[PDB]
């Protein structure tokens, strides 16, 4: 899935819009009504640590 989302940067007073591919198994819908508005599966239980 070619996902796009807003993100922060080094400058706390500025933000950026990026995109990246994500496997369907690593994404879960938020409301199941719009089709978009996807969320990372682990977001509602803990924050994963990047290896």
């Amino acid at each position: 899935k070619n996902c796009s989302f807003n993100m922060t940067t080094e400058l706390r007073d500025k933000r950026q819009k990026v995109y990246s591919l994500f496997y369907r198994l690593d994404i879960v819908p938020i409301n199941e009504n719009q089709g978009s508005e996807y969320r990372l599966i682990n977001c509602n239980t803990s924050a994963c640590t990047q290896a």
Partner: antibody
Amino acid sequence: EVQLVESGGGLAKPGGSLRLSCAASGFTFSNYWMNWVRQTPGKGLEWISGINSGGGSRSYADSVMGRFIISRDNSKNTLSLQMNSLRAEDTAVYYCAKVDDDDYGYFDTVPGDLKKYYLKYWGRGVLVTVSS
Amino acid sequence: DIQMTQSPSSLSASVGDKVTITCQASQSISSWLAWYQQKPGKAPKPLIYKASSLESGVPSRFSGSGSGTDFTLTISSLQPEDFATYYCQQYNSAPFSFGQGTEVEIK
């Protein structure tokens, strides 16, 4: 290739109302800003409105501030511009244009701000005129 | 607000002759200025996006330069299919003012 066309324009009366529409295809309409410009007969062109990819932070020119309202629908991949209290001087071939670079990248508050743009692709403008 | 000035208003040409359209700016805009042309009955098209960068698809013949208020376009009329208005539009400003347009044709 990118295909952009607009319709809805036509004969209207002074002080009335009208609505313009612009359809897009061949590209991600939800990742490109849209601006409206007019080409009056004889003299040069002129920019009159602009909207971001998200549909907010609508900008207009002093000559159409408060009369023309811009709007877009990312779901339908279309753009619109509501006309209210139009006058005789507002006769022109309103052109539907799209910016060159997408809104991806750094930004201050609006996703596409902080980046410079220029009207790259232009649609087949529609003429609008009003007379007694 | 900021407004542009384009010159010459109109001029004659031929095939092979080099014409140069140049436009001035009241305020400094560094290099954020694009050039355009429009055939009769056709929508405007882009030719130069930056003050000195060429647009994809257009022939390598076209060129032009300038910075600050001064800017210029470089033509050699090697073709008979460039005879129409050549607009000078600046950006990096709220109004995005356009130029008065310049018409060029064969004698």
